[PDB]
């Protein structure tokens, strides 16, 4: 197809594989859980306003 599209696909496919090597399961699992809980906290407040 295009050419610029192809170049940027190559650059992206390189950066992504660079990042995916840094991810470590034992830590990213905990980070995901932490953000999960943060979002739940921020939803509680909406429910509270509904009740009020």
């Amino acid at each position: 197809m295009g050419l610029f599209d192809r170049i940027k696909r190559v650059v992206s496919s390189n950066l992504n594989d660079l990042v995916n090597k840094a991810e470590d399961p034992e830590k990213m699992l905990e980070q995901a859980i932490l953000e999960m809980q943060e979002d739940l906290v921020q939803l509680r407040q909406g429910v509270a306003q509904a009740i009020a």
């Binding site: 979002d39 939803l43 909406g46 429910v47 509904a50």
Partner: protein, 51 residues
């Protein structure tokens, strides 16, 4: 006095209309909070599906 009577009727109708408008604005002010509740429901459900 003939005209004073009609003037009185007009003032009564105007007072009634003003009260009605106040009531409707209050209703809208409640609907606003109900809509915020709906926004929160939408975001909570979207959170659940992402799981």
């Amino acid at each position: 006095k003939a005209s004073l009577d009609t003037q009185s009727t007009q003032v009564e109708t105007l007072k009634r209309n003003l009260i009605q408008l106040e009531s409707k604005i209050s209703e809208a002010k409640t609907k606003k909070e109900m809509l915020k509740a709906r926004i929160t429901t939408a975001k909570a459900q979207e959170q659940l599906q992402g799981m």
